[PDB]
Design a protein around this nucleic acid. Structure first.
Lengths: 241, 119, 49, 68, 57
RNA sequence: GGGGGCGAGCCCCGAGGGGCUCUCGCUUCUGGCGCCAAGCGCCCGGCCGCGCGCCGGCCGGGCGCGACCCGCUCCGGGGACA
């Protein structure tokens, strides 16, 4: 035989007064530092308090498939890069006087990055689609701007992440991105995205502005309210029906 | 696949580098102003000190106050090429240190006193 | 204990999470002797100390 | 530009949106220490009008003073 | 002797060749031995009676 | 929240059992001891022989159950008042 009867089972009783308790998962009860507890119960306060609709309109975020299609369309129009600026200057510097180059010819259309440029070319109505990051840390930069896009008739969408919105440009953060000019090979996909965004944000801006949101209690109190409601149903539902 | 074992949150041990300076703060290191010549000032020509030399195989010296017994031992061994049994120090009420340098018994004290000049 | 008319009792428990004998300073009731098992908790029986 | 919109947005402090923002920021700044370095201006238009140019070297602190 | 002399003394001058030797007297040692044994045997008896209660009801 | 049963009861019951509320996370005759896991399952590396190698023997390791899962305040007591 390959088995040995010297192998005792010797189980442990993990009860009160019994053998000692194991090093189990204790992430629920860590004394977290002040910044961690502050940034957690700040989001808890955003869940509790009656958030006004001008702030709560940024929880309505454009979904996964349309977000990836919009990123695929914006990747065709991402601006130039550090030292690609230098290549673009050196190519025209060699084009200036080698083969009779006057250079008035052509510049490619690029994106926009700042809220100043975005608001100016929406007030000029030179925009076609305005992308807004939902997670700007001062919200006062973009509160008026969805309403301003609805007023000027420019389609506005809201995406997850100023990080991945600023990865379109070669920087860290970016809050608004405007689509000014698109090519004829991408104009159909641009019109499809404009239709899919306008049937979500612009057409029901009245429901967005009237959509108050908040008063979401914690689960420890929601379970207590549900227990009291089930107790009231148990006390008076079979007395009648 | 990572759980908090302890309920306390201690600060994580992060990597820290060492001093790899781009320029030295001083141009030259400080020269040794505690040399073997400057640490031993003079011997004593007291009759009591000469009786100590003639009887107990020692040499009496007057030393700067910032000196160790090891410093006086290596100082005598460096200056006069003589081995030292022990160094026995006091501080006079004048600011100077007095060192009774007990020599090894293979070398005489009166002969090395004649070498250093005192009699 | 000085400044106190009541005698204190060193009561040693075992810590249920770490292997260590935890001691406590209770006030012994009138009738508590040494070598006595003082229980504590919700399921404890109703007797003195 | 957007700075005038942010300017009258910080002017209209009595509206419900700015009262909510002042309540949340007042809680968040009370739950910190008495003096701490902020990495970016919470109110960039007022910071620019007083002289903050967002470049290397201009630092801002946030500080609590008792009232009365 | 003074407890830093125990650093200087030999090993057999500090304890006695016995379990719990040098820290507990032999009467309390043998009482602790028989106490451990009798509480273990009564736990065996309570476990046998509990197993018989499980087998009956 | 339901998996676990010596269980306490309800409904259905084909008497195997399934759902529902509770008891618990299993210790009270005694001045003993109790930590750094047992057992099981799934894999990995080196050596030797069958050679189709997740096959067999030796030595060394990893993961999960054991120690349930999901959560948004560390638990309680106040609280729109001190």
């Amino acid at each position: 035989k390959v088995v040995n009867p010297l192998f005792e089972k010797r189980p442990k009783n993990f009860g009160i007064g019994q053998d000692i308790q194991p090093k189990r998962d204790l992430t629920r009860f860590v004394k977290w530092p002040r910044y961690i507890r502050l940034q957690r119960q700040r989001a808890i306060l955003y869940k509790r308090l009656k958030v006004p609709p001008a702030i709560n309109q940024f929880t309505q975020v454009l979904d996964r498939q349309t977000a990836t299609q919009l990123l695929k369309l914006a990747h065709k129009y991402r601006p130039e890069t550090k030292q690609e600026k230098k290549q673009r200057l050196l190519a025209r510097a060699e084009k200036k006087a080698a083969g009779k180059g006057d250079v008035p010819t052509k510049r490619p259309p690029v994106l926009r990055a700042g809220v100043n440029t975005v608001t100016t070319l929406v007030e000029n109505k030179k925009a076609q689609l305005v992308v807004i990051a939902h997670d700007v840390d001062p919200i006062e930069l973009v509160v008026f701007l969805p309403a301003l896009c609805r007023k000027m008739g420019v389609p506005y969408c809201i995406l997850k992440g100023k990080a991945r919105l600023g990865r379109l440009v070669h920087r860290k953060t970016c809050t608004t991105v405007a689509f000014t000019q698109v090519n004829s090979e991408d104009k159909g996909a641009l019109a499809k995205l404009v239709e899919a965004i306008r049937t979500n944000y612009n057409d029901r801006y009245d429901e967005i502005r009237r959509h108050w949101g908040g008063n979401v209690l914690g689960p420890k109190s929601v379970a207590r309210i549900a227990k009291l409601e089930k107790a009231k149903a148990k006390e008076l539902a079979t007395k009648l029906g | 696949k990572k759980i908090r074992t302890s309920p306390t949150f201690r600060r994580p041990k992060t990597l820290r580098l060492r001093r790899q300076p781009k320029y030295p703060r001083k141009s030259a290191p400080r020269r040794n102003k505690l040399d073997h010549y400057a640490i031993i000032k003079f011997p004593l020509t007291t009759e009591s000190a000469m009786k100590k030399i003639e009887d107990n195989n020692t040499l009496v010296f007057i030393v700067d106050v910032k000196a160790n017994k090891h410093q006086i031992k290596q100082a005598v061994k460096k200056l006069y090429d003589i081995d030292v049994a022990k160094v026995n120090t006091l501080i006079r009420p004048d600011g100077e240190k007095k060192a009774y340098v007990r020599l090894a018994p293979d070398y005489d004290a009166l002969d090395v006193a004649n070498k250093i000049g005192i009699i | 204990d000085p400044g106190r008319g009541a005698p204190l009792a060193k009561v040693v428990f075992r810590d249920p999470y770490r292997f260590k004998k935890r001691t406590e300073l209770f006030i012994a009731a009138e009738g508590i002797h040494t070598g006595q098992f003082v229980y504590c908790g919700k399921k404890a029986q109703l007797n003195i100390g | 530009g957007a700075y005038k919109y942010i300017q009258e947005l910080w002017r209209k402090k009595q509206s419900d949106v700015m009262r909510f923002l002042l309540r949340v920021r007042c809680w968040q700044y009370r739950q910190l220490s008495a003096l701490h370095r902020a990495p970016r201006p919470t109110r960039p238009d007022k910071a620019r009008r007083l002289g903050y140019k967002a470049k290397q070297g201009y630092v801002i602190y946030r500080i609590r003073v008792r009232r009365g | 002797v003074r407890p830093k002399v125990l650093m200087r003394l030999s090993k057999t001058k500090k304890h006695v060749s016995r379990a719990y030797g040098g820290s507990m007297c032999a009467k309390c040692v043998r009482d602790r031995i028989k106490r451990a044994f009798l509480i273990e045997e009564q736990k065996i008896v309570v476990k046998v009676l509990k197993a018989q209660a499980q087998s009956q009801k």
